[PDB]
Design a protein around this ligand. Structure first.
Ligand SMILES: Nc1ncnc2c1ncn2[C@@H]1O[C@H](COP(=O)(O)OP(N)(=O)O)[C@@H](O)[C@H]1O
Length: 224
């Protein structure tokens, strides 16, 4: 009897596997973690997303030619906003459609996270060592109360949001013409934990970009 809308579209809420959510909570909120790695992980995903776009564009062209460009614009952008307490990482890479977004981001036990958890379980790894593994996107929760993802694959924009407390939400944004992701891309908005405002600082971002960028072959732009 209660249908939910956000920005003009119905909101679909999905539950995480409860047990997994429980343990994920422990590792991202654990004391003595290397919280900095969240940026390593997101930049790594942004680079992969640009690589995927480049490769698919090249193949498309081959097939368009045979019958029957902006690869140069590929970039990763990082924007702190001290007043809103947000850090935003944006790529103009492949993006995700609704389905990929629910199935890809909607499952916590990824490859690296599952690995880590199993080692902990087998007594082979300490539970504060999230950094020692490549857990990917969900590492954003090392430093965030809430995470949003706005991603466009082809003419449609979808928003994913979660505070990692049992569920995530997905809804379409029909008129995202309020913000100029051009062709495709993914915009990740981190709503930072109170104790994590140093990630709003220019010198800190630069330091991390330098530590985690050495092998990333797409330009990274830090605003301010
Ligand atoms: N920035 C991004 N752009 C496009 N797709 C993205 C993305 N960040 C994550 N994704 C998709 O979500 C999936 C899950 O991400 P993650 O949990 O970091 O797993 P991973 N590091 O093993 O790839 C990725 O494999 C990728 O397909």
């Amino acid at each position: 009897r209660e249908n939910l809308y956000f920005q003009g579209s119905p909101v679909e809420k999905y539950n995480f596997k409860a047990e997994v959510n429980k343990v994920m909570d422990i590792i991202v909120n654990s004391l003595y973690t290397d919280k900095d790695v969240f940026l390593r992980e997101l930049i790594s995903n942004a680079s992969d997303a640009c690589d995927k776009k480049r490769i698919i564009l090249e193949n498309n062209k081959l097939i368009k030619d045979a019958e029957v460009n902006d690869i140069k614009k590929l970039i990763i952008k990082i924007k702190p906003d001290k007043e809103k307490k947000t850090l935003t990482i944006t790529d103009n890479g492949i993006g995700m459609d609704k389905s990929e977004l629910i199935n890809n981001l909607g499952t916590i036990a990824q490859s690296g996270t599952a690995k880590f958890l199993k080692q902990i379980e087998e007594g082979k790894a300490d539970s504060n060592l999230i950094g020692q593994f490549g857990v990917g996107f969900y590492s954003s929760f090392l430093v965030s109360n809430r995470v949003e993802v706005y991603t466009k694959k082809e003419d449609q924009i979808y928003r994913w949001s979660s505070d990692l407390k049992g569920s995530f939400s997905v809804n379409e944004i029909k008129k995202y013409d309020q913000e100029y992701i051009k062709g495709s891309g993914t915009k990740i908005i981190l709503h930072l934990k109170e104790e994590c405002d140093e990630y709003l600082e220019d010198y800190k971002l630069k330091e991390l970009i330098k530590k985690y960028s050495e092998f990333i072959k797409f330009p990274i732009e830090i605003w301010s």
